[PDB]
Subunit: 159 residues, 6 copies
């Protein structure tokens, strides 16, 4: 079957953890939409424009990945995009109770959208965009957790 | 014995989950005070006035329920109201560590107030007011999680 | 109202933690039935008869407590005891998860039997029958965690 | 793409929860192998042959499901079945922790076998084979949690 | 060996829980730096100056404790201070997933800095500075959780 | 100061995870006692003598490590070894809960024996003796998770 999956998030910025997850998704699903939310939600270090461009570059090597931005309800977008699979990354440091809440709400909103939880490499299982941003903003080295293009952009952002 | 119990919260707005919990409480305790906190805590979608009126309507069918608003320390109000039972709803997606912290603090503040944790129906075990508000604010259908009166009020609020 | 509550468990043996919980229960409800399950699958250290005796003496000072043993389905025994409140203790977090399962199953078996979780004192928040037995198997001093009569029995049973 | 997925477990016995998960799997992948592990260390109630039979009938209505038993290393069996997706169900939180261990071990044993966690309906989020057996050992009504043929087998096995 | 340990935090204000942890640290390590972060992070009830002075007084009886303030990355300061041990208090109500995330990030940033988790007395295992501040700000008694000097300062702050 | 630390466990068998933890301990304290408990109730795969031998060789490269077996109460053995630091490893979250219980019990038995939790590398954060044995029972390759001598022993023991 030709499944269309959606992998939503703020990607602010996209990390090696995100790349790990989306790469794993492309191996089991025909088309993967990496959906970037225009979430002013607490000042996106990067803007949607930057957010999208960085993601497009970091996943350019992935043939069946499509980077697209969206506003408001993720489920409404997933429905319009005809996605039937919702990719969620599950870190060792994940808020499981929250993921359950989100998945059940998304199922209520769009039952035809099935939540699929993927696990990243042990290497990226203990980090997050906010932690990375916080560390970088406070003069810490986060080179190891980001694609080269994102690393360069981050330095420009904090300079 | 004639126990007086208090069921505190922001009820912003009251949901079917809250109704579930308070209804279960009225079956084991003589008088249940549904206490609504005037918690400006991050802009109450609804005002205390609205908050109270909506709750009064949603629990009007419950004979031994009294909806009352209060400000500042919940324990101080519970003490003045002569409550000896503190109702706490325990969702499957609850922050247990937080509930423990809260209960122990409340016990220090008022040892004569006993924390009672009740469990809602599987139906409401994965939702919360903030999630409901967030989904509704972003164009999602939350009709299923609210009493009719609250549903109508919510639509007016977001229009 | 005069509610009848049941506090089921293996109580092998009953500890100060159990005493703490049942005591809190007697202050909320008219009559409390401390129900000891045979639990053959657990290969209890003490026989049902022994555990019943131990608990009886350990709770003799509590006028409205009744100790009874049972091998039936807890739900059926609860219904037959005319109990409408099911008491459970919440100390540690992985207990909560297991407790929700039994609670939802028990609600399925007897919907009018309302689950009520109570929280023990900080003093007994880290003990369990199995841990006390483990320490006692190695001759460690567990006098602080058990009722006088239970400690003697545990000592005599292990030597 | 035509992916082959494997859904391993002890299935002692298979429950509606398992049915829920495998069903969600058949809607995402072309072929699903419901693999029943011998699991001698668990001292299963039903023999491998019995569990296989039970599952076969319980999933007969699902065209792209295949039930097979195995005593090999799950990873090796997966490779030999030509599966590239490993299905796992996430109901409760302590499962998630244990699941990450097996997932990371299995990824170490077969890196191309991608772990996929699915979430069951709220309806079966609190049941397990062991709990159903426990209730059944006490003659409790478990018809609601098992496929018709499994319930009969469970009844006949316990009397 | 002569180990130099660092115990970082906002100490806003320092509580009996903090005193408990730092006291335990001084018993196993030669020199303990109680590092106070100048974290404007959501309006420090107390200023760094106040924060430091209160801590110095509350730990004056501890000979090998040095109270020092720092800004930005904790790891950068720890490195400059030549610390090889990082003290983290682990409460029963701790965000473990967060502690893991933090520890792994700190290990990436400074591998020569080893994270050591200490456990406070049952007495302080269910509280935190934010909860204490919130309760006090809302007219609750928090005398029991603070050193006398902090208690006096807190009352002045809220008057 | 010259502290003596004890790292107790069943070590059945000792894994790279254990090696990771004890190694971190030797860098903080002068002398470390890796204490292997008989743990008859666990029905260990290897005898105490075997586990001691295995650990001795597995930690021979660590000058300040001492391997000893014991069947006494861990607290008493710690006191008799003149240890004032109790080393424990924290990998997964349900371990933390169980660890707090033993820690509080051990503090009750020997208040001057301070509990110290260390965190293993991401590399060994998902392994355990039981999981390695489980994989090995099915002939899976576990060379990556065990010291050379332990792997041989495990291979020879299972065939
Ligand atoms: N390092 C990672 N490994 C695996 N999954 C991840 C990782 N980081 C994020 N995810 C997952 O990707 C999705 C989107 O996450 P998001 O865009 O918020 O980035 P984030 O790192 O989680 O941000 P933040 O640090 O603000 O929490 C979520 O399902 C999340 O669990
Ligand atoms: N759906 C629900 N089922 C059971 N208990 C609930 C539910 N929603 C809230 N509660 C409980 O009722 C009490 C008050 O909760 P509150 O008023 O904050 O609503 P809320 O849904 O928890 O809000 P929020 O989404 O902002 O977290 C708490 O003890 C909470 O656990
Ligand atoms: N120390 C304690 N504090 C609070 N509740 C407790 C405590 N010990 C047991 N309980 C609760 O009492 C009920 C019965 O528990 P049980 O009879 O199994 O004793 P137990 O200590 O939990 O045994 P075990 O060590 O085998 O787990 C459960 O709901 C349990 O959560
Ligand atoms: N009710 C359920 N809902 C969702 N997933 C489930 C459910 N029961 C089992 N699973 C999942 O299916 C897989 C196999 O589980 P298993 O065969 O052990 O049955 P089980 O119910 O988990 O047994 P037990 O009661 O012995 O723990 C696991 O990944 C498990 O998480
Ligand atoms: N009562 C306590 N017992 C043990 N450790 C504590 C306690 N309070 C704080 N800690 C630990 O000390 C360190 C610093 O904590 P912090 O300075 O943020 O105070 P805090 O109480 O955790 O603040 P907040 O209430 O805002 O969360 C952390 O590692 C934290 O876990
Ligand atoms: N891989 C690991 N990483 C970090 N700490 C570990 C690891 N394995 C064990 N430990 C810790 O070492 C101590 C002793 O553990 P133990 O000897 O039981 O081995 P184990 O792996 O935990 O065994 P089991 O598989 O039976 O649970 C415990 O404090 C435990 O948390
Ligand atoms: Mn996130
Ligand atoms: Mn809430
Ligand atoms: Mn128990
Ligand atoms: Mn299972
Ligand atoms: Mn904090
Ligand atoms: Mn262990």
């Amino acid at each position: 079957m030709q499944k269309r999956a959606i992998y939503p998030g703020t990607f602010d910025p996209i990390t090696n953890g995100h790349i790990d997850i989306v790469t794993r998704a492309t191996q089991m699903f025909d088309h993967v939409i990496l959906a970037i939310a225009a979430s002013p939600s607490k000042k996106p270090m990067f803007t949607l424009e930057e957010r999208v461009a960085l993601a497009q570059q970091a996943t350019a090597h992935l043939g069946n990945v499509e980077v697209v931005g969206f506003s408001d309800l993720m489920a409404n977008f997933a429905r319009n995009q005809h996605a039937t699979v919702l990719i969620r990354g599950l870190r060792a440091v994940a808020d499981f109770e929250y993921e359950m809440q989100l998945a059940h709400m998304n199922r209520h909103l769009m039952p035809e959208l099935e939540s699929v939880f993927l696990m990243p490499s042990k290497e990226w299982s203990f980090i997050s965009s906010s932690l990375v941003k916080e560390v970088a903003r406070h003069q810490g080295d986060v080179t190891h957790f980001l694609p080269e293009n994102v690393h360069q952009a981050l330095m420009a952002k904090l300079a």
